[PDB]
Design an enzyme around this catalytic site. Structure first.
Site: not given
Ligand SMILES: Cc1cc2nc3c(=O)[nH]c(=O)nc-3n(C[C@H](O)[C@H](O)[C@H](O)COP(=O)(O)OP(=O)(O)OC[C@H]3O[C@@H](n4cnc5c(N)ncnc54)[C@H](O)[C@@H]3O)c2cc1C
Ligand code: HEC
Ligand code: HEC
Ligand code: HEC
Ligand code: F3S
Lengths: 537, 97, 418, 45
Positions: A473
């Site tokens: 995170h």
């Molecule tokens: C192993 C693991 C443990 C976790 N543990 C926790 C925990 O303990 N507590 C907790 O609260 N959360 C936890 N999380 C979750 C994590 O905190 C959230 O999922 C995260 O904050 C949200 O990210 P996202 O998936 O929304 O990104 P996304 O929404 O997938 O981002 C996508 C975006 O990236 C852009 N993009 C991609 N490639 C490019 C590029 N080349 N150039 C420009 N833009 C680009 C796209 O246009 C899009 O806008 C965990 C996750 C994992 C995998």
């Protein structure tokens, strides 16, 4: 392609903003790098993933990597993320692009910060405190908690913890065997082990079933008991908005007043598409929001969008993690429950925060049968001797982490790099990470405590990690602050110079804290919901 | 040439029952990993009536996929799936199965 | 508690008069679907301006047993007044105490029944009622059968109105008393035959299995879903155990009324032992959605929370109309405040939205490997269910072409006079 | 100004939009005219 508001990133934060906005009237568009991935397909991938990738936790393989704008990996690496610095291993943290965001895979531990952590600099004289105080954020905690369907230890007074003016929607599912044994022995030692609030259904909720201990809760939960961003994305898309997969955003257009008024975004085959809307929102990631802001340096903006203080991509934070692994004396039978049930919250606060970092010991509840079976196989056993070894090593396996609170030090940065390209030619981002003597002293103490826990169980074959491990995170990256010249975003999630750009992402926070923290990410994303509405009503 | 692969090891030294034709998909794959696979597997049936005190070569057809001499070895206390109170005070301790 | 309460509990008189759980009970707003349209149920609390606070004993009884609103119009037959008709005049005034005394008046307008083509004119129902012969000499306690049986005919037929959902309908959307409790599809779902037929009813069910189904809704060979989940958690579970034993007794006495081509009672149809090879595959596309809660062999869980798909009355029916609703909407009961739930897998589903084609394959795999292999699901037997079931042959009238044609043809008879 | 929708082509492959008289040649459209036609006979009485 136009609408009243554009948001990019169909993850937890972007999807919550989308659902709230559409619920309040203004139309919405979602653009996410990944495709529409369905939970069943991901489960089928995970089941056939080789038991070496299950033995040591891989959380990205079952989510097939798109070639154009991929997500990270760490079993033999794809080198999407390049990390530099003395503790480079610590920032080898994985994300999963796609609708639903990285939240597709997550132990769903959804914590509330302490009230100190919003006043960190004003309290201990280190780091930088947030812009608002916990009292100004509590309603958004409770709204996010109700929307994600968060569990909780309602009937208990525990330890340093946020003051709850409103009970958790559900109540904690009873501990398995591992958690009871751990909490008993560590109570014997002197530490308190109290349940982790989580986004699972301990009773049926929201129209999706009750958790039944599938114990696959980090990579993917087959039945939907835990929460994923895709739920909010689905609710908003059905409510009337629009979502567009694979829509990689690469450049943003502005005037000399620096109000965002257009973006050009690639589809998978480099064809540009242009979008115009009244207000634009970037919710990519703690890593992918600073990268995008650095990539769209304009004719008006030489070095980065909203970079009036040269801080975007700077102050990268994440909890450094020490691991452990041994065999208990009396059986642990780890595996019953979810992947992340308990935690030692005893240390999350105190008078030491001005001297070193506050840790949060815990352990990991993921089942051992996979790894234990592989270890007993590779010990070259055979027959009933092998089977007995498999049972012993799976009824004694243990796994403990010890995260830390890392400070924001501006020498950290997210220089988007040159040595590596992709099928769009967009830079692979690169991070410079240093931990600081703060967490060095804290981590010495954590190593001692972890060894003491190992001895208390009578641990054998204790194999601590020596290098700090990631915790996935991302905190920091676009720091909030009152003064526009030392901080990008303001106390209302609106980039200072771009009076029309809203940055709802984990880069916005000013403190890494001590707890798994996308709830605050999701309860600051719902802060930008009212900022947009009041400004467009 | 499958009944000399299902019958190879034993009942006890392996799954007492069948692989449930998950070895009939293994055997096909061992044809490609070893051309001489179907040759030696016959020769390891009469010799139990050198050949792996150091020639570990046929363990790879007994390790594997996990097949930790396995859907797993000890399923009565753990998951991979079971009912919601999976917790029941850990059940047994080493009463094999 | 209160006798007036007990009858509304038995009569299920609140499953229709409060929109959703969160509504204020006996207030109206639950828009029950119907072929003609979405009739909106009406407030029944004694409110002096909105509810039936103005109703008296003779004005109540006309509504309950003859379906006539206070001011004169005809109540739509969404009522089970054809099931409530034979109710004793004593119990009708017993309900009256409960509604006037027990429940609490609520001040709200109740949304009205916005119906299409002539079905919107109420007064024609008196023409409909006489065609349906719904006047039936209120119940007199019979004597050749002991009081355990008499109550059974009094709960199954009048109070709980098992028929009004089970027994099928004629061309004119009226009770079809030839097949009595024999099973007609009800919008999306299909109420199974519940006669005493051994291989084609519930006459083969164990006696302690039948009582256990009605009381809770959970048993090894059958789990109640859909409109029974709304009936068991709302009325039946609260009935004192002595009452269900009456229903159990009567259900054993109903004459059998058979089905087209059955070979074994729905809960004995054991299943072939097979599996998949570790999309577009009934054996994989089931294991990737359904095999987590159940198992790969469909046998379910080891204590019962996840039902065994083998020998399940929702699989082992020759009509798979239920098994496509169970996949599409999931099952959601609440007995003693312990809700057991199954995620919906439909289009607007939230765990995993399957496609109109894909559900059939999994529906077709489960039938082939667990259900009546003779019974099969076509890829478009599912689109019917998502729409609400095959259109009854009367809703065709509610489309302007079907009336305009009846218009000019109707007028063309005027010239034939000349 | 003139544009083709994706289904302005399916009309052409079918043979163009049905003139408002061929609608009569489908048994429902006559059966309805049947009973409606007969229902005028009772109106005589
Ligand atoms: C192993 C693991 C443990 C976790 N543990 C926790 C925990 O303990 N507590 C907790 O609260 N959360 C936890 N999380 C979750 C994590 O905190 C959230 O999922 C995260 O904050 C949200 O990210 P996202 O998936 O929304 O990104 P996304 O929404 O997938 O981002 C996508 C975006 O990236 C852009 N993009 C991609 N490639 C490019 C590029 N080349 N150039 C420009 N833009 C680009 C796209 O246009 C899009 O806008 C965990 C996750 C994992 C995998
Ligand atoms: C769903 C099957 C229902 C059950 C069970 C009960 N009622 Fe009902 N009621 C229902 C509908 C859809 C309507 C209106 C339809 C129409 O033709 O107008 C009604 C109406 C009444 C009325 C008329 C007075 C009024 O609605 O303002 C009364 C007095 C009434 N309903 C009473 C009533 C009682 C006492 C019930 C339990 C024994 C009961 N209803 C059950 C739908 C349904
Ligand atoms: C857990 C989240 C489930 C998954 C995934 C699937 N099913 Fe399920 N199912 C589940 C429960 C807990 C229940 C019954 C609840 C109760 O109170 O007993 C069911 C029920 C069914 C049924 C019908 C049972 C009945 O009506 O008596 C069927 C036919 C069924 N389930 C099939 C089915 C299919 C086809 C699935 C994949 C598309 C599937 N189930 C997934 C739990 C869960
Ligand atoms: C409509 C609201 C109904 C009412 C009123 C009653 N029943 Fe019913 N029944 C109904 C449905 C929709 C279903 C299951 C649908 C599916 O596909 O699963 C049932 C099922 C039963 C059964 C089990 C039959 C079987 O599964 O083979 C029984 C024994 C049963 N119902 C009994 C019953 C009784 C006694 C009722 C009066 C109190 C009654 N039902 C009312 C529909 C409806
Ligand atoms: S897979 Fe889901 S069911 Fe619960 S134990 Fe894990 S969060």
């Amino acid at each position: 392609l136009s609408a009243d508001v554009v948001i990019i990133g169909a993850g937890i934060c972007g999807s919550l903003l989308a659902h709230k906005l559409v619920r309040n009237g203004l139309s919405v568009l979602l653009l996410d790098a990944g495709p529409r991935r369905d939970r069943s397909q991901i489960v089928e991938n995970w089941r056939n993933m080789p038991p070496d990738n299950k033995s040591q936790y891989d959380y990205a393989t079952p989510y097939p990597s798109v070639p154009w704008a991929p997500h990270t990996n760490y079993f033999p690496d794809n080198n999407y993320l390049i990390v530099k610095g003395p503790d480079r291993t610590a920032y080898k943290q994985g994300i999963i692009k796609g609708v639903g965001g990285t939240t597709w895979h997550w132990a769903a531990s959804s914590w509330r910060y302490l009230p100190n952590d919003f006043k960190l600099h004003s309290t201990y004289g280190v780091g930088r405190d947030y812009a608002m105080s916990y009292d100004e954020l509590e309603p958004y905690y409770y709204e996010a908690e109700c929307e994600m369907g968060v569990m909780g230890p309602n009937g208990e007074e525990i330890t340093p913890s946020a003051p709850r003016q409103n009970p958790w929607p559900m109540t904690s599912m009873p501990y398995g065997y591992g958690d009871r044994t751990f909490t008993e022995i560590v109570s014997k030692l002197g530490f308190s082990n109290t349940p982790v609030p989580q986004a699972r259904n301990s009773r049926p909720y929201d129209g999706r079933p009750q958790c039944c201990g599938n114990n696959n809760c980090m990579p993917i939960c087959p039945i939907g008991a835990m929460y994923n961003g895709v739920y909010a994305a689905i609710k908003a898309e059905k409510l009337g908005a629009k979502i567009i997969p694979n829509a990689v955003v690469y450049a943003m257009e502005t005037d000399a007043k620096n109000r965002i008024t257009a973006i050009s975004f690639y589809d998978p085959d480099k064809q540009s598409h242009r979008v115009v809307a009244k207000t634009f929102v970037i919710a990519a990631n703690g890593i992918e929001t600073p990268k995008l802001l650095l990539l769209a340096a304009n004719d008006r903006n030489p070095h980065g969008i909203a970079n009036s203080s040269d801080l975007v991509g700077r102050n990268m934070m994440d909890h450094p993690g020490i691991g452990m692994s041994f065999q208990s004396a009396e059986p642990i039978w780890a595996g019953g429950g979810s992947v992340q049930m308990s935690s030692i919250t005893n240390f999350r606060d105190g008078d030491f925060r001005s001297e070193y970092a506050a840790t949060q010991i815990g352990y990991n509840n993921t089942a051992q049968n996979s790894r234990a079976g592989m270890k007993a196989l590779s010990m070259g056993l055979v027959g009933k001797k092998l089977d007995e070894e498999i049972r012993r090593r799976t009824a004694h396996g243990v796994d403990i982490y010890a995260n830390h609170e890392v400070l924001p030090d501006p020498n950290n940065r997210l220089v988007l790099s040159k040595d590596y390209k992709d099928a769009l030619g967009i830079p692979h981002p690169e991070v410079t990470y240093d931990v600081g003597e703060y967490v060095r002293k804290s981590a010495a103490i954590s190593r001692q405590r972890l060894m003491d826990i190992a001895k208390a169980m009578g641990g054998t074959e204790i194999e601590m990690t020596p290098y700090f491990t990631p915790n996935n995170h991302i905190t920091g990256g676009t720091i909030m602050g009152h003064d526009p010249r030392d901080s990008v975003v303001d106390k209302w999630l609106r980039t200072h110079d771009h009076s029309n750009l809203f940055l709802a992402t984990g880069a916005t926070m000013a403190a890494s804290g001590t707890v798994n923290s996308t709830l605050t990410m999701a309860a600051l994303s719902l802060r930008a919901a009212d900022a947009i509405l009041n400004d467009l009503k | 040439s499958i009944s000399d692969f299902m019958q190879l090891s034993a009942f006890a030294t392996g799954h007492k029952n069948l692989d449930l034709n998950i070895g009939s998909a293994l055997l096909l794959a061992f044809e490609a990993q070893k051309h001489d696979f179907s040759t030696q597997i016959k020769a390891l049936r009469e010799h139990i009536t050198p050949l792996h005190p150091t020639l570990i070569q046929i363990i790879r057809a007994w390790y594997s996929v996990i097949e930790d001499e396995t859907v797993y070895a000890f399923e009565k206390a753990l998951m991979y799936v079971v009912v919601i109170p999976t917790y029941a005070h850990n059940g047994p301790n080493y009463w094999v199965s | 508690i209160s006798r007036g309460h007990y009858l509304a509990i038995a009569a299920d008189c609140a499953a229709c008069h409060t929109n959703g759980r969160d509504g204020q009970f006996l207030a109206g707003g639950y828009a029950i679907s119907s072929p003609m349209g979405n009739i909106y149920s009406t407030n029944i609390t004694p409110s002096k301006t909105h509810g039936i606070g103005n109703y008296t004993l003779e004005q109540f009884s006309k509504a309950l047993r003859h379906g006539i609103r206070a001011d004169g119009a005809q109540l739509y037959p969404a009522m089970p007044y054809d099931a409530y008709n034979r109710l004793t005049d004593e119990d009708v005034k017993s309900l009256y105490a409960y509604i006037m005394t027990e429940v609490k008046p609520v001040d709200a307008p109740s949304p009205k029944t916005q119906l299409p083509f002539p079905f919107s004119i109420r007064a024609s129902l008196g023409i409909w009622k006489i065609a349906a012969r719904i006047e039936g000499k209120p119940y007199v306690f019979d004597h050749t059968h002991n009081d355990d049986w008499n109550r059974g005919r009094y709960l199954v037929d009048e109070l709980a109105h098992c028929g009004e959902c089970h027994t099928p309908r004629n061309f004119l959307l009226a009770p079809n008393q030839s097949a009595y409790l024999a099973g007609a599809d009800i919008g999306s779902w299909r109420a199974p035959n519940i006669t005493n037929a051994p291989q084609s009813g519930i006459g083969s069910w164990s006696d302690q299995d039948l009582f256990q189904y009605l009381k809770t809704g959970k048993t090894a060979h059958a789990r109640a879903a859909g409109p029974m989940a709304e009936a068991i958690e709302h009325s039946l579970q609260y009935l004192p155990d002595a009452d269900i034993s009456a229903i159990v007794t009567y259900l054993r006495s109903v004459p059998a009324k058979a089905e087209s081509g059955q070979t074994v009672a729905n809960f004995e149809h054991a299943g072939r032992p097979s599996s998949y090879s570790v999309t577009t595959d009934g054996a994989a596309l089931y294991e990737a959605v359904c095999a987590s809660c159940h198992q790969s062999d469909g046998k379910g869980s080891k204590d019962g929370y996840y039902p065994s798909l083998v020998g399940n009355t929702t699989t082992g029916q020759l009509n798979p109309n239920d098994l496509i609703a169970s996949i599409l909407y999931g099952v959601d009961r609440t007995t003693d405040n312990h809700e057991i739930l199954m995620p919906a897998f439909g289009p607007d589903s939230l765990v995993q939205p399957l496609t109109d084609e894909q559900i059939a394959t999994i529906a077709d795999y489960v039938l082939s490997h667990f259900g009546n292999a003779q019974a099969t699901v076509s890829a478009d037997a599912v689109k019917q269910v998502r729409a609400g079931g095959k259109q009854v042959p009367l809703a065709k009238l509610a489309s302007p072409g079907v009336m305009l044609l009846l218009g000019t043809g109707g007028i063309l008879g005027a010239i034939l006079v000349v």
